[PDB]
Structures are given as structure tokens and as C-alpha cells.
Design a protein around this ligand. Structure first.
Ligand SMILES: OC[C@H]1O[C@H](O[C@H]2[C@H](O)[C@@H](O)[C@@H](O[C@H]3[C@H](O)[C@@H](O)[C@@H](O)O[C@@H]3CO)O[C@@H]2CO)[C@H](O)[C@@H](O)[C@@H]1O
Ligand code: PT
Ligand code: PT
Ligand code: PT
Ligand code: PT
Ligand code: PT
Length: 383
């Protein structure tokens, strides 16, 4: 039997997946696995389309907020009866977020959180607040030839993508989701102020590039052309392989409010397709799911890309205890908030991306964009 896993794992993590899958096939004659990478957004939409069309991979792996849409569309299986209740108590609850009273996902790590990264070639002591961040960022933005072309940037990040400006929203005021976990809270001063804060970094302080997608920020940091970066724990392994001597820190506190930007903390994990071609495909998928969440595989990731296992006993390993990032990483997660997973969050992300793209393109003022983010999110939820 040949089964499939579709995932959104970055280079360093999918290298580890390949090693784990090679061992799985060696230990399970009769089962082979086809893995397919899709970027996070395309993974969600392509899994939804394939599974609604009656097909799709046996296993799908991605961020925990895909639980809401996948579960409400009936395209993934509840895992409680598959794995048993005693299974889930062995993991950090952040790795198995509950939705509608059931477990639809089990993650192999905990984190998925954004932070400040800094290149120790340039910075030894990271900024602790936004005023320091801007002052240092200006000193670290340099045009060697005085030709208007910037050679090194003070700060880079994928600031068009809503995940990357989400931490600032609660530091400027209200969270972007109300307490009920389903009502958008986007027509707020906090979102307007977040929009304006990043516009100021780009256009007034001029410490971030005018165009900076994920790969551009990634390359600039690897190439010693960005002193500071905002990125997630999924990126640690690839900067280590690229021989960047980096430190990590909280995204700096907003000076005007005294509040730490709050990263979303959660997991990326496995779900089982409601569609299974046969009993043999299902049994093989369950075997693979148990293997890829087993402590030997979690510690392989912990060893090679430096992330925190979801299994609680696995955290007693020397691999975890001796990782110099994990203590500061815990201090970063301490001011985070849990990733919401209800389907309403999907409407929030999609509305935020549409509106901030228009702001950054210069056609919509920040206040109007926050107002229309709320209206559009509510309409998408109604639909
Ligand atoms: O911006 C809205 C978007 O936010 C969330 O997506 C983030 C993922 O949760 C997060 O893991 C990260 O994705 C990275 C992958 O984990 C990594 O393997 C590699 O592929 O780089 C990715 C970043 O480029 O960042 C994304 C945001 O880009 C949320 O889960 C989404 O549902 C939401 O649409
Ligand atoms: Pt939806
Ligand atoms: Pt659907
Ligand atoms: Pt401070
Ligand atoms: Pt927490
Ligand atoms: Pt929905």
C-alpha cells in the first residue's frame, strides 16, 4: 500500500521528515509514503479542494488553525477514538487543540511563534523596546555607495502577511478576536495603530525594505544583509545550517503602550483524511501518524532543527535540556497567546490580508482598512 502526506514543512524540517520516512519504510515492509510540499496557504486550499472532491492524501500536516475549517467541512477524522484518550494526555495541550469537543490534530512540536532574531555579527544586545528597535534599526540600515540603494537593512520580515503583524495588535489594545473566540474584533484603534506602526517603519524610519516577502527577508538575513529579523521557530534550523550566528529575543515592547507584542503560540500537526481508499490505506495511515508523533521522531526534529517536542516526557531528553535557545524561547512564549482554531479565524486572516495589502499599496487609509477588515470578515463568516 502507498499512502500520501501533504505538508507545509520548510527545507530543514522536510529534510528531517525524509529521514524519518526512510526509517518508517524500512521498518514497515508493504507500506511506502509519498510526501508532497505545499506552502501553508496552498496546502489548506488544495487539501480542501481534493478532499471535497472525494480524494486527497491520507495525512495532512499544517498549523493548528486549519482544524476549524477542516473539521467543519467534514474532511478530517476525529482522532479521539483512533488514538485513545490516554494518548492525548501525554502531550502538551497546545499540540492537540480541541475543537467542537474533539481532537482533530496531533502536533510533533510546540511553538510556531514569532520572535526577534538578530545577527551577532552586528548586534550583541537586542533592543528591548520599539524606540530602541528603531534607533538601532536606523544605525544598521546602510547605503555604502550613497546611491539610494540600501546594502544592509536594520530589520526585515514578511510584514504584509497577517501572521507577522498579528503580535502587535494586542500591544496596541484589543485582541483581534473577542473572548468568545468567534467574533472578529478588527474595527479597533489597535488594528489601525498596528497598520500605522508598520507604515512608519517602512516610510518614516525607513528601517525595513519597501518590498519584503518571506524569501526576501530570509535571504537577506542569511546573507548578512539584515541585522534583525522577525520570524518563527520553524526557521532556526535553516539559519543554523546557513552558519548565521544568531540570537533570539521577544519582539520588542511597544514604547508608547508598555506592552509586549504577543506571538501566537501553537503547533503544526497531523490530521487523518475522512476519505480513505481502503482499510489497508487507513491502517497504514494510522501507523504512520503514530510513528511521526513518536518520541524518537520528535527528538530527531528537536536535535536537528531545535524545536520543542510536544510529548511531555520527551522534553526530559538532553537534546531538549541542552538546547541553548529553548529557555529564551520559553520566555518569548510566556507573553504569547494560544493560536485560535475556530473556522471564524480563517475569515479574519483572509480579510486582514486583503485590507493591509491595500494599505501598503497606498490606496486605503489605515482607519478605513480596519473598518473594512471587520465588515469583510463578518460577511465571510455569514457566507
Ligand atoms: O498570515 C495568515 C496565516 O497565518 C498562519 O500561517 C503561518 C503558519 O502558522 C506558520 O507556521 C508559518 O508558516 C511557515 C511554515 O511553518 C514553515 O514550514 C515554512 O513553510 O515557512 C512558513 C512561513 O513562510 O507562517 C505562516 C504565515 O505565513 C496561519 O496558520 C494561517 O492559517 C494564516 O493564513
Ligand atoms: Pt471557511
Ligand atoms: Pt468544503
Ligand atoms: Pt519596555
Ligand atoms: Pt500560553
Ligand atoms: Pt468558515
Amino acid at each position: 500500500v502507498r499512502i500520501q502526506i501533504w505538508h507545509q514543512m520548510i527545507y530543514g524540517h522536510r529534510q528531517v521528515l525524509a529521514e524519518a520516512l526512510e526509517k518508517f519504510e524500512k521498518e514497515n515492509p508493504g507500506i511506502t509514503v509519498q510526501a508532497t510540499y505545499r506552502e501553508t496557504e496552498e496546502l489548506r486550499s488544495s487539501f480542501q479542494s481534493a478532499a471535497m472532491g472525494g480524494s486527497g492524501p491520507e495525512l495532512v500536516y499544517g498549523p493548528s488553525d486549519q482544524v476549524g475549517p477542516f473539521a467543519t467541512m467534514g474532511i478530517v477524522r476525529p482522532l479521539d477514538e483512533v488514538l485513545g484518550s490516554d494518548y492525548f494526555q501525554n502531550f502538551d495541550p497546545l499540540a492537540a487543540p480541541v475543537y467542537d469537543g474533539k481532537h482533530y490534530m496531533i502536533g510533533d512540536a510546540v511553538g510556531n511563534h514569532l520572535m526577534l532574531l538578530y545577527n551577532k555579527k552586528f548586534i550583541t544586545t537586542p533592543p528591548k523596546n520599539s524606540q530602541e528597535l528603531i534607533e538601532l534599526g536606523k544605525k544598521m540600515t546602510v547605503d555604502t555607495n550613497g546611491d539610494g540603494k540600501i546594502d544592509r537593512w536594520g530589520l526585515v520580515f514578511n510584514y504584509t502577511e497577517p501572521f507577522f503583524f498579528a503580535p502587535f495588535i494586542p500591544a496596541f489594545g484589543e485582541a483581534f478576536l473577542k473572548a468568545d473566540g468567534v467574533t472578529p474584533n478588527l474595527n479597533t484603534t489597535a488594528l489601525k495603530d498596528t497598520f500605522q506602526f508598520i507604515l512608519k517603519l517602512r516610510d518614516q524610519d525607513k528601517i525595513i525594505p519597501k518590498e519584503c516577502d518571506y524569501e526576501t527577508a530570509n535571504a537577506l538575513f542569511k546573507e548578512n544583509k539584515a541585522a534583525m529579523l522577525i520570524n518563527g521557530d520553524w526557521s532556526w534550523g535553516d539559519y543554523q545550517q546557513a552558519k548565521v550566528d544568531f540570537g533570539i529575543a521577544r519582539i520588542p515592547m511597544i514604547s508608547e503602550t508598555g506592552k509586549w507584542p504577543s506571538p501566537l503560540v501553537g503547533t503544526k500537526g497531523y490530521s487523518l483524511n475522512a476519505n480513505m481508499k481502503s482499510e489497508a490505506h487507513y491502517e497504514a495511515a494510522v501507523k504512520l501518524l503514530k510513528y511521526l508523533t513518536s518520541t524518537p521522531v520528535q527528538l530527531l526534529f528537536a536535535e536537528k532543527v531545535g524545536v520543542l517536542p510536544s510529548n511531555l516526557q520527551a522534553r526530559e531528553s538532553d537534546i531538549v535540556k541542552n538546547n541553548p535557545l529553548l529557555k529564551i524561547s520559553a520566555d518569548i512564549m510566556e507573553v504569547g497567546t494560544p493560536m485560535p482554531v475556530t473556522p471564524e479565524v480563517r475569515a479574519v486572516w483572509d480579510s486582514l490580508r486583503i485590507q493591509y495589502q491595500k494599505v501598503l499599496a497606498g490606496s486605503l487609509q489605515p482607519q478605513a482598512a480596519a473598518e473594512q477588515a471587520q465588515i469583510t470578515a463578518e460577511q465571510q463568516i455569514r457566507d
